[PDB]
Design a protein around this motif. Sequence first.
Motif, PDB file in Angstrom:
ATOM      1  N   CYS A  49       0.826  -1.200   0.000  1.00 30.88           N
ATOM      2  CA  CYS A  49       0.000   0.000   0.000  1.00 30.88           C
ATOM      3  C   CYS A  49       0.864   1.256   0.000  1.00 30.88           C
ATOM      4  CB  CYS A  49      -0.952  -0.011   1.198  1.00 30.88           C
ATOM      5  SG  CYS A  49      -2.335  -1.185   1.009  1.00 30.88           S
ATOM      6  N   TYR A  52       2.633   1.599  -3.286  1.00 31.76           N
ATOM      7  CA  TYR A  52       1.626   2.014  -4.257  1.00 31.76           C
ATOM      8  C   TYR A  52       1.390   3.521  -4.204  1.00 31.76           C
ATOM      9  CZ  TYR A  52      -2.440   0.922  -7.283  1.00 31.76           C
ATOM     10  OH  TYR A  52      -3.328   0.824  -8.326  1.00 31.76           O
ATOM     11  N   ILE A 105      -6.350  -2.582  -2.348  1.00 36.05           N
ATOM     12  CA  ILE A 105      -5.218  -3.348  -2.848  1.00 36.05           C
ATOM     13  C   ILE A 105      -5.199  -4.691  -2.146  1.00 36.05           C
ATOM     14  CG2 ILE A 105      -2.714  -3.428  -3.035  1.00 36.05           C
ATOM     15  CD1 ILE A 105      -2.737  -0.442  -3.193  1.00 36.05           C
ATOM     16  N   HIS A 131      -7.329  -3.729  -6.909  1.00 33.52           N
ATOM     17  CA  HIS A 131      -6.047  -4.013  -7.542  1.00 33.52           C
ATOM     18  C   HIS A 131      -5.349  -5.109  -6.752  1.00 33.52           C
ATOM     19  CE1 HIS A 131      -2.561  -2.183 -10.068  1.00 33.52           C
ATOM     20  NE2 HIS A 131      -2.364  -3.474  -9.864  1.00 33.52           N
ATOM     21  N   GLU A 139      -0.674  -9.485 -11.666  1.00 30.97           N
ATOM     22  CA  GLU A 139      -1.568  -8.496 -11.089  1.00 30.97           C
ATOM     23  C   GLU A 139      -2.878  -8.540 -11.859  1.00 30.97           C
ATOM     24  OE1 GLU A 139       0.787  -5.022 -13.365  1.00 30.97           O
ATOM     25  OE2 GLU A 139      -0.284  -4.287 -11.592  1.00 30.97           O
ATOM     26  N   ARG A 153       4.381  -0.424 -10.697  1.00 31.60           N
ATOM     27  CA  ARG A 153       3.847  -1.746 -10.413  1.00 31.60           C
ATOM     28  C   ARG A 153       4.949  -2.796 -10.445  1.00 31.60           C
ATOM     29  NH1 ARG A 153       0.694  -0.412 -15.259  1.00 31.60           N
ATOM     30  NH2 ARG A 153       0.258  -2.651 -15.523  1.00 31.60           N
ATOM     31  N   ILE A 156       6.667  -3.054  -7.224  1.00 32.04           N
ATOM     32  CA  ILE A 156       5.929  -3.814  -6.221  1.00 32.04           C
ATOM     33  C   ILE A 156       6.096  -5.314  -6.444  1.00 32.04           C
ATOM     34  CG2 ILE A 156       3.612  -4.374  -5.451  1.00 32.04           C
ATOM     35  CD1 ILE A 156       2.932  -1.402  -5.811  1.00 32.04           C
TER      36      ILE A 156
END
Length: 180
Positions: A49, A52, A105, A131, A139, A153, A156
């Motif tokens: 999070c 993000y 998320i 998401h 994802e 992304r 992550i």
Amino acid sequence: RGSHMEDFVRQCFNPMIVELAEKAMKEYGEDPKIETNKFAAICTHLEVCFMYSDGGSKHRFEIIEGRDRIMAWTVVNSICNTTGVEKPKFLPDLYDYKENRFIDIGVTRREVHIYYLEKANKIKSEKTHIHIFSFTGEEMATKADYTLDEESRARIKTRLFTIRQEMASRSLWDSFRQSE
Ligand SMILES: [Mn+2]
Ligand SMILES: [Mn+2]
């Protein structure tokens, strides 16, 4: 009783995340020393999070995850009562000021769509954007609208796979993957 997983979590995540995870677990009455896989998942969800929200522009995201339940809903009401957006049934993680929507998320050890579908019906909130990230680099986002650009992304997904290798390197991955 002192578990390897709790010691791994403490030396793998930064102290600010671990503290937030502990406060979150006890706020809902759970023990990081006993329910250690959940401890690991909450830390992971928190980091994702935060990574993000770091992906956007400066003022793009309001962060809901990581707060007391009371102040999180307070911020949600302020966002709704000033954008008119629908009030979600359950607590989201961020609000996107650019796309004008809440985001939940998710991080899963299953196939992203098994997890998305359940998160979809549990929320049943038509407005809230979803998401999902997996520990295997996949994802899946609502409307195929992935919000951030590819580099943020990819950052992550890399981190999630490093966590999985660290757990696997310590024989804690199997117990972690089976416990979800
Ligand atoms: Mn959340
Ligand atoms: Mn979430």
